[PDB]
A = this chain, B = another copy of it.
Amino acid sequence: SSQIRQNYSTEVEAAVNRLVNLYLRASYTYLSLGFYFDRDDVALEGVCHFFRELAEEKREGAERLLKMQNQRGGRALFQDLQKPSQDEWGTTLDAMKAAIVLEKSLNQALLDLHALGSAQADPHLCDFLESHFLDEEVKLIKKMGDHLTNIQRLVGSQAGLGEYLFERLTLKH
- State the copy count for this chain: 4
| Residues in A62-76 with C-beta less than 8 Å from chain B | 66-67, 69-73, 75-76
Q: 8 Å CB contacts to B: which residues of A120-135? A: 121, 123-124, 126-131, 134-135
Query: Which residue in B4, B111, B150, B169 is a CB contact (below 8 Å) of A123?
Result: B111
Question: C-beta contact mask, A71-104 vs B, less than 8 Å → 1, else 0?
Answer: 1110111111111100100000000000010001
The yes or no answer to A10 lying at the interface (CB within 8 A) is: no
Q: Is the CB of B124 within 8 A of A70?
A: no
* Interface bracket on A: 35 or more
Q: Is A40 a contact partner of B83 (Cβ separation < 8 A)? A: no
Neighbouring B residues of A4 by C-beta, 8 Å: 40, 100, 141-142, 144-145
A152-164 near B? 1/0 per residue, CB < 8 Å: 1111111011111
CB distance B145 to A43 under 8 Å?
yes
A104: chain B residues within 8 A (beta carbon): 6
Closest CB of chain B to A166's CB: distance in Å?
A: 8
